[PDB]
Amino acid sequence: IPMDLFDFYEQMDKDEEEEEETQTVSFEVKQEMIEELQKRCIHLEYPLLAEYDFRNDSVNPDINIDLKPTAVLRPYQEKSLRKMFGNGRARSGVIVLPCGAGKSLVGVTAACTVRKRCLVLGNSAVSVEQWKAQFKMWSTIDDSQICRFTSDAKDKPIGCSVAISTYSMLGHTTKRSWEAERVMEWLKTQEWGLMILDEVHTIPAKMFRRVLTIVQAHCKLGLTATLVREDDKIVDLNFLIGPKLYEANWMELQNNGYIAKVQCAEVWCPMSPEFYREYVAIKTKKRILLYTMNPNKFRACQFLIKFHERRNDKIIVFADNVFALKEYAIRLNKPYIYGPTSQGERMQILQNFKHNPKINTIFISKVGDTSFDLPEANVLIQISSHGGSRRQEAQRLGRVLRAKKGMVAEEYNAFFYSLVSQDTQEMAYSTKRQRFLVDQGYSFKVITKLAGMEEEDLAFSTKEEQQQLLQKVLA
Amino acid sequence: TSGTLSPLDIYPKILDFHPVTMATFTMTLARVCLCPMIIGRGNDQVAISSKFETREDIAVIRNYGNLLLEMSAVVPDGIVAFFTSYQYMESTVASWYEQGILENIQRNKLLFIETQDGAETSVALEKYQEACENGRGAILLSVARGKVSEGI
Amino acid sequence: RLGMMRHLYVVVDGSRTMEDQDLKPNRLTCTLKLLEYFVEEYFDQNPISQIGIIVTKSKRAEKLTELSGNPRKHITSLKKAVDMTCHGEPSLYNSLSIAMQTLKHMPGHTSREVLIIFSSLTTCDPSNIYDLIKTLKAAKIRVSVIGLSAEVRVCTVLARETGGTYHVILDESHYKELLTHHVSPPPA
């Protein structure tokens, strides 16, 4: 019976003396006792099923957060917190929802419900500043106990939620990675007990994974929309944070005056003289530029901007590369936003795009993602298949697009387009993107021709024009 | 007697005597009657704490004012809304005569306030029996203690 | 069946409440469709007879078909009405006065009938409706009401006082049973 049972720490492992012989592990591996990774503590179901239990004799009895107030979440989010009360730590650990519908609120509520000494992990200071703005109803004495805790200073019991910090490892002041042994975990190194991770796809990377791996970490919750990069690490995240409690929030459940119905499309474009000579012959990182700048595909992108500007729709055009961004945008004479565009000029372009009926198309680089209060529109065009994550295409779509007036309860009232050059490595991404969007509940189709592109003025009207671009791209 | 009294105990409690008991009518099936309760329908429906129901504006505005309007507009029949006091009744229905500009029901109902008059009471019951939602016993507000309890 | 001749004024509720999806997309569609089925069955049972069609909508009365003995006008009018739908609130007093004016003209041995399909709760008319009900019973104009989920007392008295036919309809099957009862002739 476990009334005497010791349990202790060595470098990244838990060893269990004079044992109760617990299920699901090897025995006398190198001594009479059981020995697991720290990170295996998460498997509380394997003892719970057996009817086994354990005690935290290493406890520290100091004080904790109360945060008694409540607020109102979206109908699935409320169902998602209600499930978490239901399931408990044996059968909980991540939630997936867009970066534009209430993820900050799920984190402050997840900490106010769970109610333990908490450390909040985030990607960015702006997101700390948005979580502070969310958290003001549960903030103790409004503004006299909230503080930041990162590379310049630390103070107070709370802040953006409870104490927030960043994932970073540049040196001894980049907080969560350097501090990962000091404070942490109610069961051993026992100052705190609860972990809330915003942007949770950020931690399972090869160096970062160690922050999570080198503890027992009692309670853990993660929140994300991108969830994984193109190589799919996500089997690891079940171990590292916990299993996935939720994924859906389909626009099928929020149509009539609520968000958008999006017609999704992929566009297959043919390939014009000289560009495949050179695509086929070049194996280097330049070849990405011949399939993105393919003038038949540029003419589809131009024709599509013209159709939706003729109807006065608002359009964001995404370009994965600053070269591509500027070659498309300067030709189409639409503003662009990227890293080196300043805050003053970005806020002028974005205010113009949202409120000026003359400024209806803009071009944007990777800086929107994981964060850039991207503005509202009704049309999204991606010039390329990229290598950022099929799941980030759906986060980006979801956070940018809304219903056009009048038509707020129809089958579709917003539009997404991804442009693909036929007979290239750009095509490989489709059978995956198609399967992921339809599994996310989206109506998605393939457009393979445009015989009305043969009825109007567009660029690259000759071989000589196309040759002028081909020489510039090759250089 | 009092019509119903089946749990029996309160009368012997009040008397400090133990009468002979008897149930002395044949009753009809439960299905002709329906006795609902209302409190909310999603997990975000938190405005009904009623720690100070006489002061909780958000609670009066939310399902107390809003559920009444949903139920009355959907179920279009002659329906009387009973209240615990005049002050609640006045706050819940903005009416033609509002206690503030900030009150949360907009729909044709009739009032039943103090200085009721025996002749004036009948006018409101003539209106409710004749037609429309509104009248005495119809889409009208009355405090439960008040005269409407005599009925017609 | 032959023995006498009937005059019947079909009156339909074209108020905003008739749009509702409770009985076939919008009561309006289910009622006009079954009412077309009734006209052909009533005229087949009653070869020497007449009908006229009136609606109450947007707080007025309008004549969809004039009083006549050819069924074709009435099914063509029920077809033409569905497109223009329903909005607003009744005008029952003005509809019983135009119906009265046509019915008063008719001779001694013919019936004088009004059939009303009712999905409202009152009517917008200022005029005293009780004076007009007294006048219907003197004139021998009989008024029947088929109501949707509704027992509002002035309509029910009005159908009882004029002859005894206030009926409630809760399905498309029940409405076809009610119109088919009205297809049935009077004694002679």
What's the sign of the alpha-carbon dihedral B84, B86, B87, B93? positive
- With CA atoms as reference, report the closest residue to A5 among A51, A38, A53, A45: A53
User: Which residues in chain B are closer than 8 Å to C121, comparing Cβ atoms?
Assistant: 76, 131-133
Q: From CA A396, how far away is CA B10, in angstroms rounded?
A: 66
Question: B8 at the C interface (CB within 8 A)?
Answer: no
Q: From CA A269, how far away is CA A140, in angstroms rounded?
A: 58
Query: Is residue B91 a contact partner of residue B61, using CB atoms and an 8 Å limit?
Result: no
Quick check: C153 and B131 CB within 8 A? yes
Residue found by looking up tokens 């009294």 in the block: B5
Quick check: B129 and C17 CB within 8 A? no
- With CA atoms as reference, report the closest residue to A198 among A112, A116, A97: A97
Q: From CA B40, how far away is CA B47, in angstroms rounded?
A: 9
Which chain B residue is nearest to residue A72, measuring alpha carbons?
Answer: B44
DSSP label at B67? H
The pairs formed by A22-28 with CB atoms below 8 angstroms and a separation of 24 or more are A22/A46, A22/A47, A22/A50, A22/A52, A23/A47, A23/A49, A23/A50, A23/A52
Question: A78 at the B interface (CB within 8 A)?
Answer: yes
- With CA atoms as reference, report the closest residue to A340 among A320, A319, A314, A322: A322
Q: From CA A22, how far away is CA A49, in angstroms rounded?
A: 11
- With CA atoms as reference, report the closest residue to A420 among A405, A436, A404, A431: A431
- Written as one letter, the residue type at A311 is R
Which chain B residue is nearest to residue A74, measuring alpha carbons?
Answer: B44
Chains C and A touch (3+ CB pairs under 8 A): no
Question: A81 at the B interface (CB within 8 A)?
Answer: yes
Question: B130 at the C interface (CB within 8 A)?
Answer: yes
Exposed/middle/buried for A464, CB within 10 Å: 0-12, 13-18, 19+? exposed
Alpha carbon of B42: minimum distance to chain A alpha carbons (Å): 7
The pairs formed by A458-463 with CB atoms below 8 angstroms and a separation of 24 or more are A458/A299, A458/A302, A458/A303, A459/A295, A459/A298, A459/A299, A459/A302, A459/A331, A460/A272, A460/A295, A460/A296, A460/A298, A460/A299, A463/A273
DSSP label at A118? E
Quick check: C121 and B76 CB within 8 A? yes
The CA dihedral of B78, B82, B85, B89, to the nearest 10 degrees, is -40
On whether A121 is known to bind a ligand per the annotation, the reply is no
Residue A461 CA, chain-centre distance (Å), reads 41
On whether A459 is known to bind a ligand per the annotation, the reply is no
Query: Is residue C38 a contact partner of residue C122, using CB atoms and an 8 Å limit?
Result: no
Largest CA distance in chain C: 43
User: Which residues in chain C are closer than 8 Å to B130, comparing Cβ atoms?
Assistant: 152-154
Query: What is the side-by-side order of every strand in the sheet holding A94-96?
Result: A163-166, A118-122, A194-198, A219-224, A94-96, A244-247
Residue A407 CA, chain-centre distance (Å), reads 30
Quick one: which H or E segment has residue C53?
strand C49-57
Residue A196 bridge partners (DSSP): A120, A221
Residue found by looking up tokens 């809003």 in the block: B66
- With CA atoms as reference, report the closest residue to C172 among C9, C41, C19, C32: C32
Identify residues of C whose CB sits under 8 angstroms from chain B CBs: 17, 121-123, 150, 152-155
Alpha carbon of B142: minimum distance to chain A alpha carbons (Å): 33
- With CA atoms as reference, report the closest residue to B142 among B51, B91, B80, B71: B80
Return the partners of chain B (3 or more C-beta pairs < 8 Å).
A, C
User: Which residues in chain A are closer than 8 Å to B42, comparing Cβ atoms?
Assistant: 75, 78
Exposed/middle/buried for A278, CB within 10 Å: 0-12, 13-18, 19+? middle
Alpha carbon of A72: minimum distance to chain B alpha carbons (Å): 4
Question: B76 at the C interface (CB within 8 A)?
Answer: yes
3-state secondary structure of A363: strand
Alpha carbon of A74: minimum distance to chain B alpha carbons (Å): 8
Query: Is residue B129 a contact partner of residue B80, using CB atoms and an 8 Å limit?
Result: no
Q: From CA B28, how far away is CA C99, in angstroms rounded?
A: 45
Encoded tokens for A450: 């445009």
- Written as one letter, the residue type at A293 is M
User: Which residues in chain C are closer than 8 Å to B131, comparing Cβ atoms?
Assistant: 121-123, 152-155
Q: From CA A381, how far away is CA A316, in angstroms rounded?
A: 7
For A153-209, where are the E strands, in sequence order?
A: 153-154, 163-166, 194-198
Method for this entry: cryo-EM
The pairs formed by A112-115 with CB atoms below 8 angstroms and a separation of 24 or more are A112/A65, A112/A67, A112/A69, A112/A70, A112/A138, A113/A81, A113/A84, A113/A85, A114/A194, A114/A219, A114/A221, A115/A64, A115/A65, A115/A66, A115/A67
DSSP-assigned letters across all residues of A376-443: PBSEEEESS--SS-HHHHHHHHHHHB---SS-TTSS-SEEEEEEEETTSGGGGGHHHHHHHHHHTT-E
Query: Is residue B125 a contact partner of residue B65, using CB atoms and an 8 Å limit?
Result: no
User: Which residues in chain A are closer than 8 Å to B45, comparing Cβ atoms?
Assistant: 72
Q: From CA C111, how far away is CA C186, in angstroms rounded?
A: 8
User: Which residues in chain B are closer than 8 Å to A82, comparing Cβ atoms?
Assistant: 43
Quick check: B131 and C17 CB within 8 A? no
Residue C52 bridge partners (DSSP): C9
Encoded tokens for A11: 């470098």
Encoded tokens for B30: 């439960």
On whether A402 is known to bind a ligand per the annotation, the reply is yes
* Chain B interface, best mutation among C19, C93, C122, by max B CB count within 10 A: C122
Interface list for A 125-154 with B (CB within 8 A): none
Quick check: B43 and A70 CB within 8 A? no
Which chain B residue is nearest to residue A83, measuring alpha carbons?
Answer: B43
Encoded tokens for B16: 């400090």
Question: Which phi and psi angles does A165 have, rounded to 5°?
Answer: -150, 170
Query: Is residue A229 a contact partner of residue A236, using CB atoms and an 8 Å limit?
Result: no
Which chain A residue is nearest to residue B45, measuring alpha carbons?
Answer: A72
Q: From CA A94, how far away is CA A235, in angstroms rounded?
A: 12
Alpha carbon of C66: minimum distance to chain B alpha carbons (Å): 30
Encoded tokens for C61: 């009365």
Question: A113 at the B interface (CB within 8 A)?
Answer: no
Quick check: B42 and A73 CB within 8 A? no
User: Which residues in chain B are closer than 8 Å to A81, comparing Cβ atoms?
Assistant: 43
